[PDB]
Structures are given as C-alpha cells and as structure tokens.
Amino acid sequence: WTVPTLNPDTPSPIFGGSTGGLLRKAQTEEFYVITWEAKKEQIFEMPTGGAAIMRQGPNLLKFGKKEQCLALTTQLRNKFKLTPCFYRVFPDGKVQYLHPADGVYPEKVNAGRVGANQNMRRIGQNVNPIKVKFSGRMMSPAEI
Amino acid sequence: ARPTWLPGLNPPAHLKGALAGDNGFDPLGLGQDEGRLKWYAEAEKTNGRWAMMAVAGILGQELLGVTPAWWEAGAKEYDIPAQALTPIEFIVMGFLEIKRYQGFKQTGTSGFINSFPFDPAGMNSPSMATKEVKNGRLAMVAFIGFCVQALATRTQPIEGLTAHLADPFGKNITYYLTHLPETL
Amino acid sequence: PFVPPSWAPSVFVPLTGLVLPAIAMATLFVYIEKEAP
Amino acid sequence: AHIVKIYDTCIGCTQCVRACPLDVLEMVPWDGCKASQMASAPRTEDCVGCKRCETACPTDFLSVRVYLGSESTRSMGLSY
Amino acid sequence: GMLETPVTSAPIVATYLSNLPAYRTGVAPVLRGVEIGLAHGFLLAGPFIKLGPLRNVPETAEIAGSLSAAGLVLILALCLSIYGSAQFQSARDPLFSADGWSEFAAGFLVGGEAGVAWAYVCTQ
Ligand code: CLA
Ligand code: CLA
Ligand code: CLA
Ligand SMILES: CCCCCCCCCCCCO[C@H]1O[C@H](CO)[C@@H](O[C@H]2O[C@H](CO)[C@@H](O)[C@H](O)[C@H]2O)[C@H](O)[C@H]1O
Ligand code: SF4
Ligand code: SF4
Numbered sequence: 001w002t003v004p005t006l007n008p009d010t011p012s013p014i015f016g017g018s019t020g021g022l023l024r025k026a027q028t029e030e031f032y033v034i035t036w037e038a039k040k041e042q043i044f045e046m047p048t049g050g051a052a053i054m055r056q057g058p059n060l061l062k063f064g065k066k067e068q069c070l071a072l073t074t075q076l077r078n079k080f081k082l083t084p085c086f087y088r089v090f091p092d093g094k095v096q097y098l099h100p101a102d103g104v105y106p107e108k109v110n111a112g113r114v115g116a117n118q119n120m121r122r123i124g125q126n127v128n129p130i131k132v133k134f135s136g137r138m139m140s141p142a143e144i
Numbered sequence: 145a146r147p148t149w150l151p152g153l154n155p156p157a158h159l160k161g162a163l164a165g166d167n168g169f170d171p172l173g174l175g176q177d178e179g180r181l182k183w184y185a186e187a188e189k190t191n192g193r194w195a196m197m198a199v200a201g202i203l204g205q206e207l208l209g210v211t212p213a214w215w216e217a218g219a220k221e222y223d224i225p226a227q228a229l230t231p232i233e234f235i236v237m238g239f240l241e242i243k244r245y246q247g248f249k250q251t252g253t254s255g256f257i258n259s260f261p262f263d264p265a266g267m268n269s270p271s272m273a274t275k276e277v278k279n280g281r282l283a284m285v286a287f288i289g290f291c292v293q294a295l296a297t298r299t300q301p302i303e304g305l306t307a308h309l310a311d312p313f314g315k316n317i318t319y320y321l322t323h324l325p326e327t328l
Numbered sequence: 329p330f331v332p333p334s335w336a337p338s339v340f341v342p343l344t345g346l347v348l349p350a351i352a353m354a355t356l357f358v359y360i361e362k363e364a365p
Numbered sequence: 366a367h368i369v370k371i372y373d374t375c376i377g378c379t380q381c382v383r384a385c386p387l388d389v390l391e392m393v394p395w396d397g398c399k400a401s402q403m404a405s406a407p408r409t410e411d412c413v414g415c416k417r418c419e420t421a422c423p424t425d426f427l428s429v430r431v432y433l434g435s436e437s438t439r440s441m442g443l444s445y
Numbered sequence: 446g447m448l449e450t451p452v453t454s455a456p457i458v459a460t461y462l463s464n465l466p467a468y469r470t471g472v473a474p475v476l477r478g479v480e481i482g483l484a485h486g487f488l489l490a491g492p493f494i495k496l497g498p499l500r501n502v503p504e505t506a507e508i509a510g511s512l513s514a515a516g517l518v519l520i521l522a523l524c525l526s527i528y529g530s531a532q533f534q535s536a537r538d539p540l541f542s543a544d545g546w547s548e549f550a551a552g553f554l555v556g557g558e559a560g561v562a563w564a565y566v567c568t569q
Contacts, residue, residue: 265523265526265527266530266531267530267547269544269547271544271547
C-alpha cells in the first residue's frame with residue numbers, strides 16, 4: 001500500500017447545490033476532499049443537507065471540516081459498502097492524506113502502528129493535583 | 145524629486161527626507177549635528193503641540209463667548225486665587241515633563257507619563273506624522289498672528305477676520321498700522 | 329478653597345460618561361486585537 | 366488541543382475507535398489483554414471533545430479518558 | 446457549489462454593485478471615502494431633526510439635529526479608523542490595507558461632515 005495522490009479533475013456527484021457548503025475558511029485556512037469509487041449510480045444524503053446522485057466510477061466532494069468528510073464516509077461504508085478516502089487541502093496547494101492513515105481502517109488492528117498517549121496504569125493510580133502544581137502551566141495529573 | 149521649500153533647490157546633506165515634514169528648509173544649517181537634530185525634531189513637535197492646543201483654546205474661548213480677551217484672561221479672578229494656581233501647576237506640570245524627558249531618552253519617541261509612544265487608538269503611521277507637524281507648524285505661525293494682531297488691532301482673532309470680511313479692502317494691516325492711535 | 333465651580337458637572341458628566349468611555353473602548357478594542365510579534 | 370489517554374485496563378473491544386467521529390483513535394498490537402490489541406490516540410489534534418469514545422468503553426472505570434484543553438479551529442469544530 | 450439564485454447571480458444586480466464607490470476599483474481610497482461619507486452624512490441629518498428632543502422648537506430644531514448628526518459621523522469615523530488598525534496589521538485592492546484604510550477613514554470624516562453641513566444649508 002502506498003499513499004494515494006489526489007486527482008483534482010475527478011468528477012463530482014450530481015448535486016444542485018445548497019447554502020450549507022464551503023465558506024471563506026476554505027479560501028484562507030483549509031478544506032477537505034473525499035473521493036471514492038461507485039459501482040452504480042445511486043442517491044445518497046449530503047452531510048450538508050439534501051440528496052445527491054453519485055456517478056458510476058470515481059466521485060469527489062469538498063467539505064468544510066473533517067467531521068463532515070468522516071460522516072459521509074460512515075454512510076458510504078455502512079449502507080453502500082464503499083471504501084472512501086479523504087484528504088486535507090491547504091490554500092497554498094499542499095495536499096495531506098488521512099483516513100486511512102496506513103491504508104487499513106483504524107478499527108482493524110494492523111502491525112507497524114506505534115501506540116500513542118498510552119498510560120501503563122489505571123485511572124485510579126494518577127497522582128494528586130497538588131503534585132503537579134506550579135509546573136509552568138495548568139497540567140492534569142494524567143499528563144505526567 | 146521631493147518638493148523643496150524653494151523650487152530648484154537641492155536639499156542639503158544633513159536633510160535626508162526621513163523625518164516627517166521634511167522639505168529641505170534648513171538655510172542656516174542648524175540641523176547639521178545629528179545629536180541636536182534628534183532633540184530639535186522632538187522640540188519642534190512639543191512647541192507645535194502646545195501651539196495647536198493654544199490656537200484651539202483662543203478660538204474656542206472667543207467663539208463660545210468668553211468675554212475677557214485672551215490676553216487679559218490672566219488678570220481675571222477665579223474661584224481659586226493665584227496663590228494656589230502656580231504651586232499646583234508647577235507640581236503637576238513638572239511631573240508630566242520630568243517623566244516625558246525620561247521616556248524620550250530611553251526610547252527616543254514621544255509619550256505620556258509611562259506610555260512611549262502614547263498611541264491608545266493605534267493611529268500612528270508615517271502619514272499621520274506628516275499631518276501632525278504640518279498642522280503643528282500652521283498653529284505655531286497662526287499663534288504669533290494672534291499675538292501680533294493683538295498689538296496692532298487690540299481685537300480677537302475672529303473679530304479681526306470678521307472685520308476683514310466686513311470690508312475686504314478696508315480693515316487691513318494698513319489701517320491698523322497707519323492709524324495705530326485710533327485702534328488703541 | 330475646596331468648593332469646585334458651579335459648572336463642574338456640566339463638563340465632568342459628559343467627559344466621564346461619553347468621552348472617556350469612547351477612548352477607553354477604543355484603547356481596549358485595539359489592545360485585544362493586537363497580534364504578537 | 367484536547368488530551369486523550371488510554372489506560373492499561375483496555376480489553377481491545379475496538380468500540381472507542383468505531384465511536385469516534387473524527388478518526389482520532391486506532392487499534393495497535395498489544396500483549397496485555399486477551400484480544401492482544403490496545404487503543405491508541407495518535408491524532409488528538411483532530412479531537413473535538415465529544416466523548417463518544419468514553420460512552421462506548423465497557424471497562425469500569427473507563428480505559429479511555431478525554432481531558433478538554435486548549436481550544437482551536439479544529440477542536441472547536443468550526444467550518445468557518 | 447453555492448446555491449445559485451437570481452439575487453446572488455444576476456446581471457442587472459451585479460452591474461449596479463460594480464458602480465458603487467465601495468466596489469469601484471481604480472479610485473484612490475481617500476476619494477472613495479469622501480464619496481461614501483457624503484452620501485451617509487447627508488442622510489444622517491434627517492431623523493435627528495424630525496424626531497429629536499428639540500424637534501418642536503422652531504429654529505433650534507434644525508441646528509440641534511444637524512449638530513447631533515455631525516457628532517455621530519465623528520463617532521463613526523473613529524470606528525472606521527480603529528477597525529483598520531485591528532484588521533490590517535501585517536490584497537488586490539489598495540483599500541484593504543493598513544495604508545489604504547487609514548486614508549479611507551480620513552476621507553469619510555471629511556465627506557461625512559461636509560454632507561451634514563450641506564444638509565443644513567439646504568434647510569437654511
Ligand atoms: C519650535 C519651533 C521649531 C523648531 C524647533 C523646528 C525645528 C526644525 N524644523 Mg521646523 N518649522 C517651524 C518651527 C520649528 N521647527 C515653523 C513655525 C515652521 C513654519 C514657518 C517650520 C517649517 C519647517 C520646514 C518647512 C522645515 C522645518 C525643518 C526643521 C528642522 C530644521 C533643522 C534644525 O536643526 O532646525 C533647528 C531650529 C531651531 C532650533 C529653531 C530655533 C529658533 C529660531 C532660530 C527662531 C526663529 C524666529 C523667527 C525668525 C521669527 C518668527 C517667524 C514666524 C512668525 C513665521 C528641525 C527639525 C526642516 C526639516 O527637515 O524638518 C524635519 C524643514 O524642511 N521646519
Ligand atoms: C452620561 C452619558 C450620556 C450623556 C451625557 C448623554 C447626553 C445626551 N443624550 Mg443620551 N444616551 C446615553 C448616555 C448619555 N447621553 C446612553 C448610554 C444611551 C443609550 C441608552 C443614550 C441614548 C440617547 C438617545 C436615544 C438620545 C440621547 C440624547 C441625548 C441628549 C439629550 C439632551 C438634548 O436635548 O440634547 C440635544 C443635543 C444637542 C443640542 C447637541 C449636543 C452635542 C452633540 C450631540 C455632539 C456635538 C459634537 C461636536 C459638534 C463635535 C465633537 C466635539 C468633541 C470632540 C468635544 C444629550 C446630548 C438625545 C439626543 O438629542 O441625542 C442627539 C437622544 O435622542 N441619548
Ligand atoms: C427601536 C426602538 C426605539 C425607537 C424606534 C425609538 C425612537 C425614538 N426615540 Mg427612543 N428609546 C428606545 C427605543 C426606541 N426609540 C429605548 C430602548 C430607549 C431607552 C434606552 C430610548 C430612549 C430614548 C431617549 C432618551 C430619547 C429617545 C428619542 C427617540 C426619538 C429620536 C431618536 C433618534 O434620534 O434616532 C436617530 C435615528 C437614526 C440615526 C436612524 C434610525 C434608523 C433608520 C431610520 C434606519 C433606516 C433603514 C433603511 C430603511 C434601510 C434602507 C436599505 C436600502 C437602501 C437597501 C425617536 C422618536 C429622543 C426623543 O427626543 O424622543 C422624542 C430622546 O431624547 N429615545
Ligand atoms: C494643560 C491644561 C491647561 C488648562 C486648560 C483649561 C481648559 C479650559 C477649561 C474651562 C472650564 C470652564 O471655566 C470657565 O467656566 C465659566 C465660563 O463662563 C466661568 O465661571 C464663571 O462664570 C460663569 C458664567 O457666568 C458662572 O456660572 C460661574 O459661577 C463663574 O465662576 C469660569 O470662571 C471659567 O474659567
Ligand atoms: S479504551 Fe475501552 S472501548 Fe477502547 S479498546 Fe479499550 S476497552 Fe475497548
Ligand atoms: S472525544 Fe470525541 S473526537 Fe475525541 S477521541 Fe473521543 S470520540 Fe473521538
């Protein structure tokens with residue numbers, strides 16, 4: 001598995017449009033692009049409101065925040081049994097790929113992943129807040 | 145080609161056009177010393193700033209109907225006698241000026257008390273610097289007109305303008321200067 | 329010696345109720361919006 | 366950014382990963398439980414603080430904990 | 446994309462906006478400030494004169510209302526100035542810059558007060 005490269009010329013579903021789409025943020029900070037393959041033309045529900053028809057073959061959509069992309073991904077996987085993937089696109093033209101980070105959806109365990117933010121203790125074994133006081137910033141006992 | 149006070153005049157070396165309101169007008173070469181120029185530049189503003197407030201005050205007092213002449217106001221009597229005005233003014237005015245000098249030495253810019261620069265509204269810009277001096281220079285020249293016109297005419301600024309407006313050719317400097325005893 | 333002039337409220341009420349608030353709000357609005365170097 | 370911590374009482378049910386609506390969590394190999402897998406939080410910069418993961422954790426007390434912290438465009442869930 | 450609509454996308458509407466001082470590019474920000482200030486300043490005098498506290502006084506109503514319209518223009522000019530200070534601290538049009546907006550605010554004050562004064566002259 002290798003990191004996919006986004007194709008900006010991918011066709012988009014048949015959608016009239018709505019007022020729930022991108023705002024000025026997309027032009028200044030970032031936006032998100034989700035792409036997938038469709039076996040047949042079908043009607044799905046846009047997370048921004050309304051219904052759109054997915055073309056047979058590749059499809060591409062642009063959303064304002066990550067949660068909107070992953071909300072559509074859940075719908076496509078659960079009902080239509082598709083395998084979408086989405087990116088983060090910056091105004092400068094850079095494209096960042098994510099979900100699936102390594103090509104396998106996170107629900108399935110995969111070798112090569114490195115545990116992060118894992119504490120080898122229980123919640124009840126954290127230190128008291130007094131012992132992490134005056135540490136330069138508000139710090140919870142869980143952080144240390 | 146930056147405009148100069150005299151057309152066709154090349155600005156002298158010590159005037160580089162950096163300071164706001166620069167026009168190459170240093171015929172006597174007073175600003176040739178960089179150390180003195182920095183002091184003079186700040187000194188120009190403060191003389192102008194006092195002038196601008198003074199010109200507004202003289203006009204404001206006249207227009208609002210303040211009967212005493214702007215030069216006779218000192219003799220007038222107020223609730224607080226002169227026994228207390230001078231001691232308060234010296235103490236209050238000294239503190240503002242003492243701290244003004246201290247800040248200028250450290251930073252080199254104007255300020256107020258502990259604020260150097262004193263720009264609460266963030267209006268400071270290269271354009272505003274030029275607008276400050278040019279209005280300031282105008283006030284300085286205008287104020288002297290108030291003082292000189294007081295001697296020649298013994299009349300308030302607007303009263304003089306209205307007199308000039310009344311008869312344009314009349315009520316000029318020639319009448320007051322030639323007929324000095326009458327106006328006195 | 330202490331008694332202020334009879335016209336003091338005419339100047340100080342508008343000054344503290346309309347003028348200083350305007351400068352204070354402008355000072356605070358600029359300050360909060362100011363960006364760090 | 367919020368803080369998300371996984372504690373050693375995890376049984377590797379994967380319910381926290383499925384629940385997360387921003388793909389913040391993932392499962393990694395482990396030897397401390399029968400399932401031989403543990404939850405991980407590699408992408409906390411995308412966490413919004415919904416705490417759907419905590420709702421889904423079967424262990425008592427929770428094995429995944431979310432501590433709301435500094436706010437940002439991503440953690441505040443803004444599309445503008 | 447965005448929901449197309451005649452109000453959002455129509456030829457007649459677009460041309461009208463393109464001729465307004467705000468959208469008319471190629472004009473110095475100061476001049477646009479004067480043009481905008483004059484229009485608002487002239488209108489601002491109306492409501493103060495007719496519905497002010499001194500509206501029923503025969504001759505003082507005109508003076509008091511216009512003098513209050515001049516005051517509001519002064520407050521608005523301050524709002525324009527500080528907005529530029531906060532917004533532009535670091536693009537195609539010169540207006541949306543620290544230098545441009547400062548000129549724009551100055552023009553609004555000059556135009557606005559001129560409009561208020563011009564409105565007064567119309568009455569008397
Ligand atoms: C408080 C008064 C004052 C001061 C300190 C200055 C200082 C300065 N001016 Mg400014 N200026 C003033 C008033 C003043 N000006 C006024 C009133 C006008 C309008 C008439 C101007 C118009 C002006 C121009 C057009 C230019 C300057 C410039 C300068 C610089 C010249 C170099 C130097 O070292 O000068 C030092 C000067 C002094 C120490 C002055 C000492 C006192 C003098 C000798 C008294 C003269 C009295 C006069 C003959 C009689 C009154 C006349 C009046 C009624 C018209 C310097 C920063 C030049 C510059 O580049 O500025 C950045 C420049 O281009 N000035
Ligand atoms: C202490 C605070 C304060 C003060 C002093 C005032 C004062 C005033 N208010 Mg009130 N007001 C306030 C707070 C205040 N208000 C607040 C917080 C609110 C919101 C709840 C209101 C809402 C309000 C309304 C809705 C109205 C008033 C009005 C008035 C006026 C009533 C008296 C009259 O007949 O004026 C007559 C006024 C004049 C003859 C002109 C006075 C001077 C004008 C307003 C400004 C001149 C500026 C000058 C030309 C240039 C700048 C000078 C400056 C730099 C020194 C008077 C100017 C009435 C009014 O007429 O407003 C215009 C009015 O309709 N106020
Ligand atoms: C919304 C409610 C409301 C309304 C309509 C009024 C109305 C009025 N009040 Mg009152 N007032 C209110 C609430 C209200 N008040 C409240 C809540 C308080 C308590 C804080 C007061 C306290 C108060 C005081 C103390 C005074 C008044 C006074 C007044 C009068 C003058 C106000 C004035 O000068 O406005 C100025 C108006 C404007 C600057 C413009 C108004 C808005 C314009 C018309 C919008 C136009 C939009 C346009 C149609 C858009 C076109 C778009 C197109 C071009 C595309 C007027 C009868 C004064 C008076 O004397 O009354 C008799 C007075 O002294 N009011
Ligand atoms: C650096 C700062 C320098 C000083 C700046 C001073 C700015 C000007 C402040 C003026 C304040 C008002 O002051 C002015 O009020 C009244 C004007 O008719 C005068 O007051 C006098 O006359 C009034 C009108 O008949 C009466 O109601 C008063 O009882 C009487 O005391 C004051 O004697 C005068 O000084
Ligand atoms: S944290 Fe809880 S829900 Fe997630 S894998 Fe561990 S036991 Fe299961
Ligand atoms: S709080 Fe919400 S976004 Fe963060 S890890 Fe838990 S489920 Fe995911």
